[PDB]
């Protein structure tokens, strides 16, 4: 049996959030796609949180 678990991808995929259409960049617009991954290495992220 398996030991480790990356439950995050399971959660994203099961609810239907994660898909090619969701990640596709919008056409002729500046709003971000339906799914966005943030960064925890850029300085000041936790301060903004």
């Amino acid at each position: 049996p398996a030991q480790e678990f990356q439950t995050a991808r399971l959660f994203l995929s099961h609810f239907g959030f994660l898909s090619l259409e969701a990640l596709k960049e919008p056409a002729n617009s500046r709003l971000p796609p339906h799914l966005i991954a943030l960064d925890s290495t850029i300085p000041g992220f936790f301060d903004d949180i």
Binding site: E4, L10, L18
Partner: peptide, 24 residues
């Protein structure tokens, strides 16, 4: 030697879903 959805997109979607879910 002398010698109806397209199957490829469905197979690609199934492979991506399977890899995301069951890998590991």
């Amino acid at each position: 030697v002398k010698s109806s959805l397209e199957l490829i997109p469905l197979t690609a979607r199934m492979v991506m879903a399977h890899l995301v879910n069951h890998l590991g």
